[PDB]
Amino acid sequence: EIEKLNNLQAVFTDLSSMDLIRPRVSLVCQIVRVGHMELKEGKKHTCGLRRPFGVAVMDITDIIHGKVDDEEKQHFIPFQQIAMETYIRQRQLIMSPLITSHVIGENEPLTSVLNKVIAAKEVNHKGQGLWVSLKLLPGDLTQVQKNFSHLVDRSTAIARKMGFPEIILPGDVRNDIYVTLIHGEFDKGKKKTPKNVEVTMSVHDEEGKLLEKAIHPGAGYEGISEYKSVVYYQVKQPCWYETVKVSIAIEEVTRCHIRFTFRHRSSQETRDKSERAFGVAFVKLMNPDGTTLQDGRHDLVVYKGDNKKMEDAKFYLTLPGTKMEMEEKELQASKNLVTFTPSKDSTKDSFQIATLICSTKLTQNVDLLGLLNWRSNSQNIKHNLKKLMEVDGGEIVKFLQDTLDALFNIMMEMSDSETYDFLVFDALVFIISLIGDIKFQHFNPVLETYIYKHFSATLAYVKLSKVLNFYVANADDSSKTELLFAALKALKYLFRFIIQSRVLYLRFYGQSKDGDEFNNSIRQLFLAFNMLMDRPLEEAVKIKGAALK
Amino acid sequence: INHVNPAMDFTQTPPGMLALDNMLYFAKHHQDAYIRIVLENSSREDKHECPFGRSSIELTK
Known part of the structure; x- marks a missing residue:
């Protein structure tokens, strides 16, 4: 060209x-x-x-x-x-x-x-x-x-x-799915030449029908419906370091499986064209929990033998293609020998893909999607909250506002476990501390947008002022400190939340039945600060410095 | 201009032989850019082609 x-x-x-x-x-x-x-x-x-x-x-x-x-x-x-x-x-x-x-x-x-x-x-x-x-x-x-x-x-x-990026703007639109091919096992066997695999990775809907253009093996080049791969000369453990890129509608990809067929290529053209895929693998593009398959080096699962069970589209939705999933299949088979049994179609071949997808909409956080549908599984909220402060910032900031609102649903609807709500407080403190950084400074406009537009809480200011006041006054514990240290390094934005809560309540309610006690809560709040800065500062020198900060 | 008596351009001193010494020592040491010159002169057959022999004689003298 x-x-x-x-x-x-x-x-x-x-x-x-x-x-x-x-x-x-x-x-x-x-x-x-x-x-x-x-x-x-x-x-x-x-x-x-x-x-x-x-x-x-x-x-x-x-x-x-x-x-x-x-x-x-x-x-x-x-x-x-x-x-x-x-x-x-x-x-x-x-x-x-x-x-x-x-x-x-x-x-x-x-x-x-x-x-x-x-x-x-x-x-x-x-x-x-x-x-x-x-x-x-x-x-x-x-x-x-x-x-x-x-x-x-x-x-x-x-x-x-x-x-x-490091300068991470919201709406840095990336529907950009990156999957990488490295190596697989393919032994010698009968024909002691290891089988001449040409990767034919195929992107289907939920019923094995190939869609168009979805594979973009070239950045700056246009997409394809079907992919042929480069060939190594019968390496018994071939390595590719191969890299292709795909981009799918964020909704259809939720109902897409992608099938991977490995065709055997003889030296001659005609027998190369007549021979079909001796082995067929695939992977889904989701998790039954609604998350997407986690990233990282995933050794893959392929089989030989059958060719109808490897193409019956509605069935081999229910087949293994990767490790994590093959051992979950066998474990749920290890605990019940009904409806799932590892088969005898397995060959001594293999492959592996190290997946790392830089897109805004997929969610490889099991705890996050436990949070989102919490009505179904509000039991783990103990462990969900416990493990929130161990989440990567990027996944958070991806859907921060929706996660915020979910959290507000927990704290509003579930009013029973106040200590759970303490954990809620800590989690949102973690969130806002992440937000304050120059790694994610761009989302503060988004936070103001959510607040002045979608901040729909009304009871939040009362309960959260109570929570923070209990925190600050009763912070003598050294383990309780660093929570309050980060809180003190997060005062402004949570105060914004409190104020929007109160004003929304008042516009919902015309006037105040709690203004007296609310401003009281403020007064005892400052009293808690005073008592803080009058305790032996031996416990919180830095912390009370940050308090006056 | 001539390819039946190619060594005609070797009888004007300045400089004569030292241009050949130049290109010798470059062939000894700067081989990377040397072959790069050799194959970069290998695309322009219009008047933008640069004569290494004639460039050498002119420059050196």
Whole structure:
């Protein structure tokens, strides 16, 4: 496509000086051939199949530091490539003839390749490589698509890095699902060549019907309905480091399963085309609790044998595809040998995906979705609250306002366990402490929006003033301190909540039956502060300093 | 301009041989940018092509 012959302006966003402080900084560039399986003749191979060719590497440590600003300079990337070199390396080995060996062209481990080319201090490229000048432009699409039209046009491609920002704006719209492919097991067996798997990952609705465009293996390139993968030359434990990206409607993805079929590829085109998927795997895109599958290295589950139970769409919703789920299946089978039994369709093959999805709407927090539907499962609220202050900030800030309102539902509807409400208080303290940071300073406008718009609590000010007053006055306990330390570092916003609560109550009620006692509660509140700052400060030197702060 | 008597441009000193010494020592040490020059002159066949031999003689003298 000669469209990108000349006008290649690219920008791979989500990079910061946090990414800079990585001790050594580099860019990795592997290029694969598409077409014939192998660049020789003798038989006809399938049109358009892939064997990797090599990696072009330059390090960009101070290159991205931008000390030298050079528009034209086409730094040469020495294109390390797989040594297809059997012309002189073997022809003359004399005085000891006993030689029977093979060729490692796609039998090559990728960690070795990558770390070697990093640690290989010279690559004799044989006059092979390419030409770029990597430039680092501060700001986002606004600046580069206004200021740097000479550096970034509209057609300028984009790549979205595997990073939640540090300057995290609300509505940093990311429906951006990133799934990565690394390695699997595939033994030798009958045909001692390990099976020639071409990953055919497929994205279905809830009934095994393939949808269109949902796979976007290229950032800045467009989506596909079906995916073919690159091929390694029958590695018994093949490694891919393979990476594709997908993007689905946040609702339909809730009712989507994605099936993964591994087709066997003979050398010749026709038998490659006639042979079908010897093994079919998949994964859901949710959890029965309503959460999404947790992130991280997930070894995958695949099977051989059946081909109708691996395509009956309404059934193999109910099959295993990944570890966590296969052992939950077997454990619920380990406790009951009814309706689930590990089968005899399992082959000695495997795969693994390390999933890390940077999207706003999925929720890989079991405690969070326990919180949200709490009416169903308000029992764990003990442990839910216990484990809230152990939650990552990002998942929180994703749905902070809805979680706020849920919490207010707990504290309003369930008025029984005041101590539970103490835990509620502590959790919201944790929340607001997270909010106050410069890691999430952008959501304070959202908090004001919720307050002056959706703050629907009316009883909150009374009860919470009571709670905080009990806290502050009765803080002599050292374990009770740090809770109040963080509270004192969070006074303003919770006070905002209290005030909106009171004014909403008064507009709901015209006037006050509790104004007397409420302003009293304020007065004893200040009395509690006084008594604080008149206790032996030995307990809370810093804390009472922060109090006057 | 000539490829039947290629060594005609070697009879004007300044400098004569030291240009060849220059390119020798560059071939010894700066091999990366050396072959980069060799293959970067390998795309422009219009008048933007730069004569390494003639650039060398002109510059050196």
